[PDB]
Write an enzyme that holds these catalytic residues in place. Structure first.
Site, short mmCIF file in Angstrom:
data_model
loop_
_atom_site.label_atom_id
_atom_site.label_comp_id
_atom_site.label_asym_id
_atom_site.label_seq_id
_atom_site.Cartn_x
_atom_site.Cartn_y
_atom_site.Cartn_z
N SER A 254 17.03 -10.57 59.93
CA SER A 254 18.32 -9.98 59.52
C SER A 254 18.81 -10.44 58.15
O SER A 254 19.85 -9.98 57.71
CB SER A 254 19.42 -10.22 60.53
OG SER A 254 19.14 -9.56 61.73
N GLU B 1 15.75 -1.77 62.26
CA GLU B 1 16.09 -2.71 63.35
C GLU B 1 15.82 -1.99 64.66
O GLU B 1 16.10 -0.80 64.77
CB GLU B 1 17.59 -3.00 63.28
CG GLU B 1 18.02 -4.01 62.27
CD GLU B 1 17.82 -5.36 62.90
OE1 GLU B 1 16.81 -5.52 63.56
OE2 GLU B 1 18.68 -6.23 62.82
N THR C 275 22.20 -14.97 58.33
CA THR C 275 21.12 -15.46 59.19
C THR C 275 20.07 -14.38 59.46
O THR C 275 20.30 -13.16 59.18
CB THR C 275 21.77 -15.88 60.53
OG1 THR C 275 22.49 -14.75 61.04
CG2 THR C 275 22.76 -17.02 60.36
N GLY C 276 18.94 -14.82 59.97
CA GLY C 276 17.97 -13.95 60.61
C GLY C 276 17.30 -14.65 61.73
O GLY C 276 17.07 -15.85 61.65
N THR C 277 16.93 -13.93 62.76
CA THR C 277 16.21 -14.48 63.91
C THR C 277 15.20 -13.46 64.39
O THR C 277 15.47 -12.23 64.26
CB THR C 277 17.19 -14.82 65.04
OG1 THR C 277 18.29 -15.54 64.47
CG2 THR C 277 16.55 -15.61 66.17
N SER D 82 25.69 -9.52 62.11
CA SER D 82 24.28 -9.12 62.10
C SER D 82 24.10 -7.81 62.88
O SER D 82 23.10 -7.63 63.51
CB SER D 82 23.40 -10.18 62.61
OG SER D 82 22.13 -10.14 62.00
C1 LIG Z 1 18.39 -10.19 62.71
O1 LIG Z 1 17.93 -11.30 62.43
C2 LIG Z 1 18.24 -9.58 63.91
C3 LIG Z 1 17.53 -10.17 64.87
N1 LIG Z 1 17.39 -9.65 66.07
C4 LIG Z 1 16.70 -10.37 67.13
C5 LIG Z 1 17.31 -11.75 67.43
O2 LIG Z 1 16.48 -12.61 67.83
O3 LIG Z 1 18.54 -11.92 67.33
C6 LIG Z 1 16.63 -9.53 68.44
C7 LIG Z 1 15.86 -10.31 69.52
C8 LIG Z 1 17.99 -9.07 68.93
S1 LIG Z 1 15.72 -7.96 68.08
O4 LIG Z 1 15.73 -7.27 69.52
O5 LIG Z 1 14.41 -8.60 67.71
#
Ligand SMILES: *C(=O)/C=C/N[C@@H](C(=O)O)C(C)(C)S(=O)O
Length: 266
Positions: free
Chosen positions: A43, A141, A210-212, A101
């Site tokens: 993200s 996304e 952030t990003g995840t 996000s």
């Molecule tokens: C931005 O970083 C968005 C990330 N999205 C993922 C997260 O781990 O928060 C999910 C798992 C929501 S997406 O379904 O990969």
């Protein structure tokens, strides 16, 4: 001492791959660790995405109402999924994309840029305009978070994204009024308290995105201001790809890398 050794120790302790870039300034050396290695954006792309939308349009465009349906809701959209009936303005979308996000907000902002791949080519072109020849966005996304390790799609490098953020928040990539809006949204982010912000003392200002993602991905890109008002860009990127696609992202890794950075910028 060798700060690279301490980043290597974080990698060992967290079973992680860490990337860090803090651009050099008139008063400080760069900090660079795996800075030219690729990491998924996740993200973190939403900050330069907002910049791209601000860059491409007059500020009156922030008032344009975007409508969408429950079928447009994507993992995860904390704001957009509560405004399916009202829609949201481009400015509200920018707010949500950075501060929560919000994935639907980011996909609608990508669509607002236009063109093939629902705006992903346009986004990549915006980074090319900033001098970034490495980063690329390929998917919307949430798929952009889920590429396997080694796949260059949807990647940047700490070096590239830090120099993008530098130009956007501190530099003159945006006119100052558009720059102020990006900065304010990042300054009021709600998702970053456990990442870079956790590594800098309370008298430093932190703004971030952030990003995840899969493979233990956890990223944070920030601009920090010292108590004497000196700014720095801090890009921290991590994954735990050795642990598999469902490796747990570790916010603490980013907080501790940030603490090591704060140590040398103090
Ligand atoms: C931005 O970083 C968005 C990330 N999205 C993922 C997260 O781990 O928060 C999910 C798992 C929501 S997406 O379904 O990969």
């Amino acid at each position: 001492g060798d700060l690279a050794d301490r980043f290597a120790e974080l990698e060992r302790r967290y079973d992680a791959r860490l990337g860090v870039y803090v651009p050099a300034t008139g008063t400080t050396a760069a900090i660079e660790y795996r800075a030219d290695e690729r990491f998924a954006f996740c993200s973190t792309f939403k900050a330069p995405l907002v910049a791209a939308v601000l860059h491409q349009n007059p500020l009156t465009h922030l008032d344009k109402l975007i409508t969408y349906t429950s079928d447009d809701i994507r993992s995860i959209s904390p704001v957009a999924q509560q405004h399916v009936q009202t829609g949201m303005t481009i400015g509200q979308l920018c707010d949500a994309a950075i501060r929560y996000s919000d994935s639907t907000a980011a996909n609608l902002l990508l669509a607002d840029l236009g063109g093939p791949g629902g705006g992903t080519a346009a986004f990549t072109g915006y980074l090319r305009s900033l001098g970034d020849t490495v980063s690329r966005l390929d998917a919307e996304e949430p798929e952009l978070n889920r590429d396997p390790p080694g796949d260059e799609r949807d990647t940047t490098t700490p070096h590239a994204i830090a120099l993008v953020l530098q130009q956007l928040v501190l530099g003159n990539a945006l006119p100052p009024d558009k720059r102020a809006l990006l900065t304010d949204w990042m300054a009021r982010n709600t998702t970053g308290a456990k990442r870079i912000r956790a590594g800098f003392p309370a008298d430093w200002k932190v703004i971030d995105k952030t990003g995840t993602g899969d493979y233990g991905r956890a990223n944070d890109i920030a601009v920090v201001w010292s108590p004497t008002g000196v700014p720095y860009v801090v890009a921290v990127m991590s994954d735990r790809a050795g642990g598999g696609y469902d490796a747990e992202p570790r916010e603490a890794l980013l907080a501790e890398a940030a603490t090591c950075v704060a140590g040398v910028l103090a």
